[model samples]
Target chain A: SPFHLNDAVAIVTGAAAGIGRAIAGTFAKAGASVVVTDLKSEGAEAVAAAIRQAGGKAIGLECNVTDEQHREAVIKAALDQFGKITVLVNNAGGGGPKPFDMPMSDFEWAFKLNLFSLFRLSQLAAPHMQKAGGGAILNISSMAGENTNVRMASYGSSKAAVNHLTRNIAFDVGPMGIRVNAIAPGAIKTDVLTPEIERAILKHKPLGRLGEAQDIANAALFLCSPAAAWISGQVLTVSGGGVQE
Target chain B: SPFHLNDAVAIVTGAAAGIGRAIAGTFAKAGASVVVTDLKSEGAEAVAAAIRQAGGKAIGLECNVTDEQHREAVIKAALDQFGKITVLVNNAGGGGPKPFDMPMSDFEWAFKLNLFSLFRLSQLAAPHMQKAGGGAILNISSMAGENTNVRMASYGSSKAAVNHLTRNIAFDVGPMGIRVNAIAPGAIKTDAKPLGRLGEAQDIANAALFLCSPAAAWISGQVLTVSGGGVQ
Candidate 1:
């Protein structure tokens, strides 16, 4: 009952699946008009359609975050659809199975999609948020960035910059009546989880369970809501007390 | 390498045992002069003596947090011993077997020792922290407050208030250059453990030091969960 985002306009990147979808739905349930955007048009449209059928305000948009034109188009579409933008969720990111030895171009693409796109979209939305008086930006960082696990070095490295950028940009934008914070989620049972992996995680997870999507969504709601109004430049790790092995 | 609390003076409540002891010792190891306090003088003195024996700056003070006179004496003693209070750890609290069926007095006791002491101490420490230019206050909240377990309503309710108090106090003190944060520790290996392996005190101490250090300079009014990865 401490949260209510009534009439707020939000754009959630990668809202078609996993934690992003949960966040999108959670915001809509809390009375925010959300723009559901993802790389897959069908997934995005289906989520938006489902939300609409359930009596919520949402729109689906196909967005390849690495494309500069697509980033601008989405922001333009968001303003045209909702009249204003108050919350921007930097959630669209994936490293595409790239390893530590990936080609230089692939390495560059990792940063572009994970770190650079958020920077570009955030820049585009900053003025709109400033004009609207104040806003909140929630970046979905990964626990992989914080954890010193072996392998997936490329993905971890990209998200690590994301964590730093969240803090640096928070200071830059704090004066503009905007607040920026990030969530570093750990081991939620998303589509990427295999049966073997799930068993391993549950066996070793300190909390004796895996995190659900709502665990992260609940944290996002709190950060974007007025409860976390004074909180800035912090990373709230939403792991189900699952201490890394 | 990410943390340094050099030359800072700290007051840790319930420093005679458990999480408070770990936090106090950790700060001292990081170069802060610590005031070890508890209701029991013997326990407090022993801990402080141990720190001093290990070549750290510390003094012991018997403090009943709920008693205004004792609380005042402890604060005065802390300042007299160390010149300034840059860190205040509100970590002393327990419900003492008070269940849902407990009397009204039990419920009141829980709040007084846990929530009210934190509020009164924060009020006392705020001026000193401001006078010192800037400081940090770390409240010890429990996972019970965040999790909706069935019983022990009194303990859970009191800790819930502590979590809120941390945030409410931050707003008041942030403009004064003091940062306020709380650690919602989950199932720590204290006295109560009939279940899974408990989280070590060092894990919590690590977080406490981080919140107090410059690495978390921009973090204020936040409740960081140090419950080993428990979503709760």
Candidate 2:
């Protein structure tokens, strides 16, 4: 509850959906001005408008993260509206259950959506963040990416790459007064998991339940807060012990 | 210095060459019954023979760890000769500085040789170790895996997977009276780093000294980066 973000400018990608929406709401409730962007402009506007109606400063923008120009446009929108950017939550990607059937082009697509976008966004945001003295980049990865299983080739490998990339980027940006880390959400109950997944809940999944969108949102709030200032290049899993335990 | 491995039974993979050889030798000198295994059986035998000649109980065997069938052979060799296998030091596998251009097939090969072998070897060794009442698994991960760099995609990713897999496997086996962990050696002055990066072999050997000894009894699911200068 000490996570008071009064007047801070917070940017969240893919904010039209479940986990992203929850994180953006949490930031706005904590007193920060919010920039919520999604691939769907109307969806982002709806979420931002809802927050604005609840007495918070919010802006909605569209971002097709796989494109460099769209990423710049999204960040530029945040800067144009908020005047200062301090916290960034790169929570904008997912891996389906059957990623292996997807071709190498599919893996490349998933990498751009789920992994490379985090890199490009963080790289672009870091310069502005450094200029503003310091900031936190909370990358949203997944427990599936952390572990290996059949059919998870593309998603898993790309997430593994993100896990490796976050810390390396941190070392470069750490001395510049910024922190970069990842949140690997455990098996959460998001809309992305269709009804088929719920029926297939085998014994391997811990907690006897899937993961909740809010579960990750709470974790993002922690990483964005000042409590995690010294912790950089680290990945904290928020999937109810989903990191294999 | 207090990390004494007196009377412990430890296994060192890739024990024929540089860092692996040094670690096996150091552990033997610390009073542990060592089981040395490598792709080159003769080279490994020479090292083990040296330990025995210096008044140590050691057995050298051929363990092409990339193959699980060969893993069972090493396990059988260790149990039949030493009676109890206590610690497994996963130190095989190397990195190509030009891994980015390498094919994904080679990436899979590196995964099997470097990461999956650690998993299977730990699985094969854990039961005996549990019956022996609590042991340690020291996976030799690298700083490249923990930190990111260009042209190190496969090596770094493989080691990263090792660290995470070690964490998950520790949780699985910890309930069975066995502890699992990994060591990330940063810029160690192995033959690979000709100029000198970090004297991590000694530092890592020291850390492993703790993990295998009573000092690190409570430490599990941890990746201790034993880098003298390459890491903060």
Candidate 3:
């Protein structure tokens, strides 16, 4: 299978829950040794153990993605365990609304967690990827960045930056054979999608349903695998054909 | 290596020029038996001849996609020549500017070629695909479908319909293992690109090739943008 990842070693952040966990599982099933990192140590370990139980290679690491030292430690663990890293899924990101009256600190915090961590981790991992030949970097961006909402200023701005950063980095890294791309999911049926919310979203989604976590996971699998070798610097909008956003 | 397309039989519409030619050439190189269809019979024959000269299996047939009878004839030719159909690229479509006072015929005509033909061809070809176990249908949409501009009402609306149709078909067909997708090209140096510096045909071809290859086996109902970072 072109989407197979037999020799690859992947690092997926915020992989303890939702989309990240699904991506980690999908990669492992396709033959990648995965490093599952998240703020929830137990949850991360549980996911890694599950992969191991399924006979896939995996390790769980507790990581505060916003912290630089934690980022280094996570990279070190992957190297120590799997020898070299070939895929990195910057899937750790979420920030509550920071309204206009909120302090600037809230906006800064959102940027640090949602945007800055991705920038730092990718910079730290690029040399390893380049040294090992070439690698794929898939960032998890969102529809909120592309489409504006009333009270999501802080979260929206950071993700918008992530989108621009993905394009900018792809140019510099393309010649190195390191592919960079992003997946912008819309209204996935996670905890975020209540029944009322689902009804509203389904109307806009041309597919007549909200997205599932597996939808984004499958997209991540293709982007990181050889199937997407020629694809880079593109944000695949996995919104079920919803052109609204 | 996973992008290999060995033994797959492909039908690329509008194979006489531009993107269709590039896709036909690329698929031939990747080990596919190609059926080159176009409104221009000589152009289609020339493309098929070039592929054969290059040691690839190919046949050219004339097809004015707007005509219903013509569509069936093309399908018959593909089935007779290749014994099965595995890939279909709906690449033949266009419409002139329709400012306010354009005739309703013009609007209907655009839909005939752009949207209706796609709907009909895929339906006609689907049973063959299912009989062969599975297949891939790729529609060549445009950025205008997603990001509209003035005076392109007929063209834009038709492509928009194409996009929605691709997604809807994917669901019903997924159980049968067939995949449906589209490629929306941005301003490339195509003859239409204003700056005279649109993207190369290979850029779109590469994505189309990937989409049809095993690499995109699990990907369906998505319209990938190969505009070279021009638009969203």
Candidate 4:
């Protein structure tokens, strides 16, 4: 009951599959009217339909979070359907160049998707949330933001920006009764990995297992719900105790 | 249900009043067998008695956490009464010199209470927790650890150390199924007041309950800043 989101209307981007999908389903089960959005309409709608079948309130929308039109459309849809917005999970992000010999444009694209989109979406949704009497915003970051790895320059730097932005936004929105936080997940099972790579990662993971999408989803539910009212401007790492040096 | 601590045996220091008292009571309501400790036996026992009357399992003991004998006694009391120690909240800490003309002894005392006591207690509780399968430790810190404030040289520096120690210890004990974390609370409406309203003891207690609960099972080595979303 501590993680209950009853009467809360939430919008989760990249809800077509993986961590985003799990957060949508989990929030809906926690009694939130969820708006599931992704780049693909059919997959998002299917996830929303499943939630409805499971006796939860939900709708699906096609939203490329990096695009202005799509961003406005999702906000409008959530307001039109749920009458208000109380939560926004900036879950859609990724795609960057390899570590070396990358184009400047490729580097810029990563920021646009990972950092800029989150900032824009929060800006768009804050007013509605304020009108609805405060809300919560969650950004799905990655361990790469803090822990450096090969081939993660663009993605990692952008996510590091996400972490800092989450803190600043919390200060800005605190007076509005809105809280901001982020979850930086370590190597999750959603990505395809060779057996050797999995073993290498496990050696560093204290829990001796890669994370599941639900692990991040569970953390998402806690941060966004009333249970975390006093908690803000914090980036909680769900890494199975992965050491971040 | 995510914050349930059913079957847990917890020891909360500084439980005589304020934030510590609230955490003790909240954890008890969430199904933990709490060991409420304070420097004063009467106040601790009174709090414990209230919990018992409220149908929760609890006991009280006099514990000056900075004293080795008292620290050992409190840990022994928890294990003796509850059979195991699955949680330990290091909430007993404070005391430092003024910003100017501060003596080294005063600064040392602050570290002894705020940082060293926490490190020592966790060392004492870790093996027992490992034997019990797993455990969680919550350190009650202050926003001064992260944000600078006047006349906080000793207190703030020690808590900064507390936050760093929490992270390092989490790595050390992660393999043992023991998690370490800290809550750096802002200006809560405890110990004093001002013109504008501040945070409440319940706000901190809620965070303590969540971090020590199953909902945060995968979370470790993090300092949760509960400051009403402001820097304070």
Clashing pairs in 4: A1-B1
Which residue runs does candidate 1 get wrong by more than 4 Å? A96-98, A191-200, B1-232
Q: What TM-scores do the predictions have?
A: 0.51, 0.57, 0.51, 0.52
lDDT of model 3 at position A221? 96
Taking the tens digit of each residue's C-alpha lDDT, what string does model 2 give over B159-230?
A: 776776666566557766777778887656677533444474666677777777778888887888776544
**lDDT (tens digit, per residue) of candidate 3 on B1-232:** 7796786889899889899999999999999899999999999999999999999999999999878788899899989998999889999998755552345467457766786677667767878888888889999988766553445545554565566556656765676678989999876656433345658887788899999998899999788888757673
Best by DockQ: 2
Q: Write candidate 1's Cα lDDT for A25-91 as tens digits.
A: 9998988889999999889888888878878999999999878899899999989999999999888
Q: Mind giving the per-residue lDDT tens digits that candidate 4 earns over B1-232?
A: 6779997999999999999999999999999999999999999999999999999999999998888899899889998999999999999998743542255457456766776677678878888888999999999987766664345545655666577556655766777898888999886888754336788899899999999998999988788987777885
Candidate 1 lDDT over residue span B64-137, tens digit each: 99888888998899889888988999998877334333454664567677766776777688788889999999
Deviating ranges (above 4 Å) for candidate 3: A191-201, A243-245, B1-232
Residue clash pairs of candidate 2: A186-A239, A187-A211, A188-A211, A189-A211, A189-A212
- TM-scores of chain A in all candidate models: 0.93, 0.89, 0.95, 0.94
Q: Point to the candidate with the largest lDDT.
A: 4
Worst 10 residues of 2 chain B by lDDT: B96-105
Consecutive 10-residue window with the lowest summed lDDT within model 1 chain B: B96-105
Instruction: Please say which candidate is ahead in lDDT: 2 or 3.
Output: 3
Model 3, range A1-245, lDDT digits (tens) per residue? 69889899999999998999999999999999999999988999999999999989999999999887999999999999999998999999988554433454564566678766776788778878888889999999887656544455456545655665566567657666788899999767774636886677677768887778999999999999999999987888898886565
Q: Against the true structure, what is model 2's DockQ? A: 0.09
